[PDB]
Amino acid sequence: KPFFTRNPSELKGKFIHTKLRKSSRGFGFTVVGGDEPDEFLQIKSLVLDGPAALDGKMETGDVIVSVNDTCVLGHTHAQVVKIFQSIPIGASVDLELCRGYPLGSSAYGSVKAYTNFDAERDALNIETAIKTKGVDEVTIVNILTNRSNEQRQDIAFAYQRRTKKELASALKSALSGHLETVILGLLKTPAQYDASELKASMKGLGTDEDSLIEIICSRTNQELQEINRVYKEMYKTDLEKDIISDTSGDFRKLMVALAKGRRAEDGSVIDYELIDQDARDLYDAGVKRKGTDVPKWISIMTERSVPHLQKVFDRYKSYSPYDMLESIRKEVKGDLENAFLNLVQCIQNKPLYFADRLYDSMKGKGTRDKVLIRIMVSRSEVDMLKIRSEFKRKYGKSLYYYIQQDTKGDYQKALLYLCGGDD
């Protein structure tokens, strides 16, 4: 449905004019959109060292409004690239760009990108709140929980360019308690946050196996590829190496296999014969025999695609008297059991999986603030709306309500903003 208009008097954000001279390799940027008749054309990326980058005015997500004094709102994708390719080398082009319409965002997240974003103005108001006697946490929460994670990356850049000190440093010295734990987590890129939460769970021989299972069993292939890279840049050791250090047994093999992020991508053709054979092989390895063939479970549940395994688990009920989750609760035990239980829940319904973990972190005495904060931070821009939807259906009350009754202060207001809505 993304908003579209052919009249420039109906655009939201601010406007930018540019003059780019065509080089031997073009203007140095790519464009997306343009199939759908009513679809904007937006800058997807800028070739570094190219004309668009070395001019510094063009940014990703910019709606191309007009090219060479000709409005291109509603132009097809092929009609626009013909304008840029008709320009000879050495000649320039006039681009009117609109900043304020977003791009590859998640339809199910709760924290969306601020339209009238001003990284300089935000870093200004944060410093004023940080330096306020009796630190003004209200404004800090009002800004950071209302910006996208990449917008927070720009605020951290602007804050350091003005005060010559890091934003994470100044906020760590000004905040305390659980509010600090939330705000510092919101300032990390999703890979950096996961990479830090993983190392934090392998602090010693007393590994937090719960947090290790949560991050590994829920992250996709593309998310885990980024985690493995960022984890080595930050800690100078492979994520797999620390997992091998602080795990053992079949639980080690299941965590290492999932962390590689080499799961077979979702296929376009449904393999009905493999769905049945995988279902029988899970049954033959577990309930049907004495003991369990754990390697056969790890191979099937980590290598097949998620849409495939969902069909495998439904077909599995045709052979076994107990479904896949109940089969796990009696074939294996311990940390291995907790891993297979979480993995299967992330395959069947991942939003429902995080809804249960939020309920578990708040149902009892006190709060598992560690689990609660990580789920709200990590899932705020991915599927937070689906998490709230499954939560209210199953538990009657909203996720907002359970956070309200279990947390207080500005720490509560930070979590409620990441949850979204007024309830």
């Binding site: 073009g26 940027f29 464009v31």
Partner: peptide
């Protein structure tokens, strides 16, 4: 998914 370098 239309996408072209310029």
């Amino acid at each position: 998914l239309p996408s072209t370098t310029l």
